[PDB]
């Protein structure tokens, strides 16, 4: 019998309508117990002689506990920098999902997928992709070659393609720009960066280097050779120099571009992902680039 916990809820004391229920006059001549007397009108204190305080700020100075969710490991990554591209109108038909749900849903199913598991799902290791020096002491030509007995020789950028980027880098930077503001902020993303950034910078194709996908901050894009500026961020994601502001507008000064510090590197689209692009289109572009580069070293 019976039922429990419909879900709290309420009916409606709808101000406009009185007619749906009819006359409410069919109950008894009731003699209550004296606690249901004790919550009556005059045998409670009446509201007609009540007093009220005057300030709303007194509650916010009385409180002593802050917000756990609003006091977390704060960062400076723009929330619009996480928004993927979408061919959906503002006003969907009723019964269909709207665009804010669609953007969120592609956000969680982008961040739920890892790119390294994608790599060894395809059967590809990025450290072996990134070209190495020749070790003529230990002869490369042997009877055990997985496919090229000679290592990767011309770089991945020289063999890649670009038009499968859903935005061109100009509106990538425009998406990085805040609306109604000249200020621009670093775009989160992951780059195939050498773990040893030092030996990466004095010898990018060393055999002792190892090349993993690690998170970076996209900063600028140069057009004449078409590269993206990246720099490693820490756990707070705040990007400083010796005097401490977040790197905004690349630190571009009117006297000239900033001198290069040790960490910020120029990387290609073969090497970089955005946080607002699909790891699945990333997968298809990188496997088609690997297939075409295999075809061209075959020729």
């Amino acid at each position: 019998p019976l039922m429990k916990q419909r879900g709290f809820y309420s009916d409606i004391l709808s101000p406009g309508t009185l007619d749906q229920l009819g006359e409410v006059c069919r109950g008894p001549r009731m003699s209550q117990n004296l606690l249901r007397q004790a919550d009556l009108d005059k045998f409670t204190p009446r509201v007609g002689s009540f007093e009220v305080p005057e300030d709303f700020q007194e509650r916010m100075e009385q409180q002593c506990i802050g917000s756990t969710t609003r006091l977390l490991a704060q960062t400076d990554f723009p929330l619009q920098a996480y928004e993927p591209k979408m061919q959906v109108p503002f006003q969907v038909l009723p019964g269909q999902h709207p665009r804010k749900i669609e953007i969120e849903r592609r956000k969680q199913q982008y961040l739920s997928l890892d790119i390294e598991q994608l790599l060894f799902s395809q059967g590809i290791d990025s450290n072996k992709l990134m070209p190495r020096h020749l070790d003529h002491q230990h002869p490369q030509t042997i009877e055990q070659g997985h496919d090229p007995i000679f290592p990767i020789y011309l770089p991945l950028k020289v063999f890649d393609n670009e038009d499968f980027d859903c935005r061109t880098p100009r509106e990538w930077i425009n998406m990085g720009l805040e609306p109604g503001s000249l200020d621009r902020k670093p775009v989160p993303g992951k780059a195939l960066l050498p773990t040893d950034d030092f030996l990466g910078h004095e010898d990018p194709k060393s055999q002792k280097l190892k090349y993993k996908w690690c998170e970076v901050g996209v900063l600028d894009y140069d057009e004449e050779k078409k590269l993206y500026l990246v720099h490693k961020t820490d756990e707070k994601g705040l990007v400083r120099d010796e005097m401490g502001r977040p790197i905004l507008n690349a630190g571009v000064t009117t006297e000239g571009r900033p001198p290069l510090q040790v960490c910020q590197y120029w990387v290609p689209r073969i090497q970089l992902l955005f946080c607002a692009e699909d790891p699945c289109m990333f997968a298809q572009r990188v496997v088609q680039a690997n297939a075409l580069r295999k075809n061209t070293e075959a020729l």
Binding site: D11, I12, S14, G16, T17, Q20, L21, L93, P94
Partner: protein, 43 residues
């Protein structure tokens, strides 16, 4: 088998109940594509 008297009892039996929120049905019926069409008559 069912009877017409039984269907009269079924029309009498059920309780009367209304919306989740009146304004909730108002904006849903206000953003219906049909209401978009009477909005087209309003323009």
């Amino acid at each position: 088998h069912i009877t017409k008297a039984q269907e009269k009892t079924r029309k009498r039996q059920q309780p009367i109940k209304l919306e989740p929120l009146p304004v909730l049905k108002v904006y849903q019926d206000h953003k219906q594509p049909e209401y978009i069409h009477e909005q087209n008559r309003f323009q």
